[PDB]
Amino acid sequence: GFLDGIEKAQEEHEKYHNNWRAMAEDFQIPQVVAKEIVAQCPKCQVKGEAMHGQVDASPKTWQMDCTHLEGKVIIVAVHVASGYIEAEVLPAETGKETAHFLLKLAARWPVKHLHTDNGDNFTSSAVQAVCWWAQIEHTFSVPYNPQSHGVVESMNHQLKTIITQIRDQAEKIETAVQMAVLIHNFKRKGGIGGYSAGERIIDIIASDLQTTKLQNQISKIQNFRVYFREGRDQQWKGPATLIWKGEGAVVIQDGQDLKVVPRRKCKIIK
Amino acid sequence: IIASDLQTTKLQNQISKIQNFRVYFREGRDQQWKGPATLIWKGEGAVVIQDGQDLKVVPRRKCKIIKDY
Amino acid sequence: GFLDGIEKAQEEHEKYHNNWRAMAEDFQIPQVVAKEIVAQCPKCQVKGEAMHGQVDASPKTWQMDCTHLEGKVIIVAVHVASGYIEAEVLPAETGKETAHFLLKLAARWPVKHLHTDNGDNFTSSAVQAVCWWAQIEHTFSVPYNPQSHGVVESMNHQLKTIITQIRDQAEKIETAVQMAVLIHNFKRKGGIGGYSAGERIIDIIASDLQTTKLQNQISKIQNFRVYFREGRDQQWKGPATLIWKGEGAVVIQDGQDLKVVPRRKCKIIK
Amino acid sequence: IWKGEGAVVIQDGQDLKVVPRRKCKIIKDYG
Amino acid sequence: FLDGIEKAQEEHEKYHNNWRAMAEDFQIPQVVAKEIVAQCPKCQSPKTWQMDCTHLEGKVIIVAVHVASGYIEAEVLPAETGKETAHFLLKLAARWPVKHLHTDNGDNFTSSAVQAVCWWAQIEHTFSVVESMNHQLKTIITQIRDQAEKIETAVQMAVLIHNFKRKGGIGGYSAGERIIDIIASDLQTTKLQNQISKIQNFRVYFREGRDQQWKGPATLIWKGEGAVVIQDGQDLKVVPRRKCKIIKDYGR
Amino acid sequence: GFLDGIEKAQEEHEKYHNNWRAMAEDFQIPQVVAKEIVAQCPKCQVK
DNA sequence: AACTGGTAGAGATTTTTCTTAGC
DNA sequence: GCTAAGAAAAATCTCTACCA
DNA sequence: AACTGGTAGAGATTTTTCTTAGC
DNA sequence: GCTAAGAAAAATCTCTACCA
Numbered sequence A, C: 001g002f003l004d005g006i007e008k009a010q011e012e013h014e015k016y017h018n019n020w021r022a023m024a025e026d027f028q029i030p031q032v033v034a035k036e037i038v039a040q041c042p043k044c045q046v047k048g049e050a051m052h053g054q055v056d057a058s059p060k061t062w063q064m065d066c067t068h069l070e071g072k073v074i075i076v077a078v079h080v081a082s083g084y085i086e087a088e089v090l091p092a093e094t095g096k097e098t099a100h101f102l103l104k105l106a107a108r109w110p111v112k113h114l115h116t117d118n119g120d121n122f123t124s125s126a127v128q129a130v131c132w133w134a135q136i137e138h139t140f141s142v143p144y145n146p147q148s149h150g151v152v153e154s155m156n157h158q159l160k161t162i163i164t165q166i167r168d169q170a171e172k173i174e175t176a177v178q179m180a181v182l183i184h185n186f187k188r189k190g191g192i193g194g195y196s197a198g199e200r201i202i203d204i205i206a207s208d209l210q211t212t213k214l215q216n217q218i219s220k221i222q223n224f225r226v227y228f229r230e231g232r233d234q235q236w237k238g239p240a241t242l243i244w245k246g247e248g249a250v251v252i253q254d255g256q257d258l259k260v261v262p263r264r265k266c267k268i269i270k
Numbered sequence B: 001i002i003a004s005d006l007q008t009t010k011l012q013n014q015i016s017k018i019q020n021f022r023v024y025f026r027e028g029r030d031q032q033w034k035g036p037a038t039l040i041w042k043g044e045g046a047v048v049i050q051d052g053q054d055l056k057v058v059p060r061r062k063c064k065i066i067k068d069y
Numbered sequence D: 001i002w003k004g005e006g007a008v009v010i011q012d013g014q015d016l017k018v019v020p021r022r023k024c025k026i027i028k029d030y031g
Numbered sequence E: 001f002l003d004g005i006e007k008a009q010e011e012h013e014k015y016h017n018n019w020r021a022m023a024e025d026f027q028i029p030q031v032v033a034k035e036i037v038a039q040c041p042k043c044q045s046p047k048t049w050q051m052d053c054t055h056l057e058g059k060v061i062i063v064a065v066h067v068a069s070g071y072i073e074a075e076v077l078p079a080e081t082g083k084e085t086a087h088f089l090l091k092l093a094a095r096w097p098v099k100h101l102h103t104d105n106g107d108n109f110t111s112s113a114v115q116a117v118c119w120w121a122q123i124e125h126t127f128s129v130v131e132s133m134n135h136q137l138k139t140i141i142t143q144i145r146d147q148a149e150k151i152e153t154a155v156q157m158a159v160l161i162h163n164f165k166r167k168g169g170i171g172g173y174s175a176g177e178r179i180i181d182i183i184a185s186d187l188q189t190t191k192l193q194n195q196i197s198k199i200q201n202f203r204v205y206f207r208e209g210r211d212q213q214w215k216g217p218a219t220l221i222w223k224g225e226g227a228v229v230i231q232d233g234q235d236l237k238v239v240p241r242r243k244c245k246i247i248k249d250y251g252r
Numbered sequence F: 001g002f003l004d005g006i007e008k009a010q011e012e013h014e015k016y017h018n019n020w021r022a023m024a025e026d027f028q029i030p031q032v033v034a035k036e037i038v039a040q041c042p043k044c045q046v047k
Numbered sequence G, I: 001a002a003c004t005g006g007t008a009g010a011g012a013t014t015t016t017t018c019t020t021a022g023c
Numbered sequence H, J: 001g002c003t004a005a006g007a008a009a010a011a012t013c014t015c016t017a018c019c020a
Ligand SMILES: O=C(NCc1c(F)cc(F)cc1F)c1cn2c(c(O)c1=O)C(=O)N1[C@H]3CC[C@H](C3)O[C@@H]1C2
Pocket: C065, C066, C117, C118, C119, C120, C146, C147, C150, C153, C154, G005, H019, H020
């Protein structure tokens, strides 16, 4: 048998910390036992699970960060769904200047969600009062994880490369910062629609407003309710709103949730 | 009387085998690996763990979740 | 036409530094002209070509580097084709101790090619005299490019993880270094043949010697020369040595070069 | 098939090909 | 196939050949030839090292020698305590597979530090070749002494000349080629033994020609693509695969 | 882990001589080790 | 004119092996 | 006795951090 | 119990467009 | 007049460094 091999393998891992293939080959135990012996050791288990996530890309989400260049402090804000950049040079990295930059940005463009890191200027009472008055949801990243806001750190890189390209056409650094913002927003194309960033933010916000008005006018004159049968149990749920009846399935709304149900499990009543 | 205890032990066995997981995470400025903690919520990208009566949010790229057989 | 658009596009790139899609869309020139306008600018051209190379993996090649741990200086050497590790703790990072480590290594295992970085201990007259006496070819990497010796830096990582696993079983750091070398060489399996590193270096060197002796005995009694026709011009080359005649092609040796020629372009003479 | 000084001839899936010496590993592979 | 097995058994009954030669001659697989050797009543170390210390020019030289090949590893010690001997033994066991250590009844070899190292690395220590190796190393050291400044350089240069530059023995091999061939042959033996045990955990019910009934449980030796070799009644025989049933066996 | 389950199932089969599906469901060990426990007993047989 | 990224582990997906019920 | 469904155990494939 | 990597450019490979010779 | 070979120009796909 191999039960004595299981005991000798546990003593061997306690001294030498083998991996599972070494024990499964030298003691001739099955591989599930060797994997369990390794999985019950706390001196091992030093490795993550090797995947990446995906940030939020809603049409009113902004991300914000600070960078340094030639002894100055730049503050960068990016519109995530389009790539649109605003930037400024601060005299100090306090919370007063960050609150004023956020107030001017919220006065110019519609902001509803803001994502930042845990720096001392972004976790401040002045930024808290500005977000309260202008009705913004402020969310913070997991600490010491800059991948949670990857768009604004990538735009830090793009801004610094443009600034080194056009540095000899200006005298100060604030002039070169604003020239780099103009070159990024309007003079570089390529991406989703072949647009620049200014054309893309115009298209995204205009499309948002147009599609809300269109489907308000559609949904205010609707009828033809649908009773449908779904779930693990074959029950029947009540009044659902038919949205679009298609070649193969229908789309219903139930309790402010969108669902796609085929034609065999639904009945339409006028 | 006995049959009710059979049903209670079966239901408690399924409840205990649903969500008994351990988590080894990596956190802080100097990112070291720390001891076992209890999994609470698992979304795509990050997890919420309870360690020493403290709730922490760790990404799924910096933690290992060990199940049971 | 678009020739005036070409002139306006050159002035526009001189001021703003557009990419090629912006100029090709705003001035309606073909894309080859816009790519040429960007390619003649020296303020641009800041990007590599996005590939990787492949290091040498001959059966007698070694790579060497130094690392630091708890205020000490470790020196690591790796056999590249198998993954076999030797390591030591040096009292100083000079050239005398590096020459003595290389002399002991060359006395134990056959070394013919050594690859290092450009540190001050590896570019030294003592290491030069040891490589001269023991007949080793010493090659150095491109400066500030650690990817040229990736095997020894990866083994620096593996050694430090094992040392933190077994640190509480020893008192000093030299003891823990030698215990980590034993655990890496003999207690971890998985890889090319399911081997450990010690089994793999034994298999590689034994296979090298066996295959030289076998093909010496084969080639000392050979005959059946082959005249073949190849090249852009249909000429005929002289005496070539037939090695293996196969179903579809033959393998010949010409001027100590191996070639594979099909049957239609070769004639065998006994 | 044949091991040279700078090249190695192998048969791979009924295809004879020539690889450089620094891109090969020759094992007997007990297993 | 079966003709090869019959000729292999008759030739082993005459001359008692080894299994590598029988497999290469009679063109049978290695597990069958190893079973033919293992069934014979008359037919039933690569990891042993020796250590010693010596003196030269007021220094202490410690020498370890692989016995079956004559392979030398040497060093210069600053003292003769048990901690330095334990460090030399730990470095040696970390570089080569050491299973059995043979020494004499010195003080530094009979120590708690050496005992702790042998406990951790699982070596069998035995107290009682190295005299001949000390004499040979001292002759090479005196032969090349004018090329080195210190004694440590001359010691390691003599170890290199002993291991790779001197040829002798039967075929004219050095000590490094001999130690590599010995350890590689032992590795081939252990891998084949793992395959043999994993195959021999099965069982075979076979049906002979001109019958409908299954015979007794014969042990499977080799399971090919079209044929099956079994051991039954102290006899090795080849059955086609369409008259066989292989089932798992639990007879521990 | 199920290693304490392996030890407890060995004590339980030494008393009552269980089968392998019973031990694999009661002690939550994999089926191969439960079949090996039944195989090593000289009085029982896996079936 | 002759230089160069790699190693090992965590999960996910595909494949092979083993027991048992049905005809 | 033969065949197929089901599940367990093993093998392969893609992706990540760290190495001054 | 409600969190998360991304951006843009350098080459390689596949596809579409345009001129011209042959039947 | 119709059709196909050949080459130029455009479109798509995979892979890399840097962002405290
Ligand atoms: O950055 C280092 N490693 C990290 C790393 C890697 F390993 C592999 C990668 F693909 C990428 C990486 F980022 C690293 C740096 N240096 C040296 C190293 O050996 C070394 O590994 C070294 O010895 N010198 C000497 C020679 C001149 C002076 C002293 O500076 C250099 C600095």
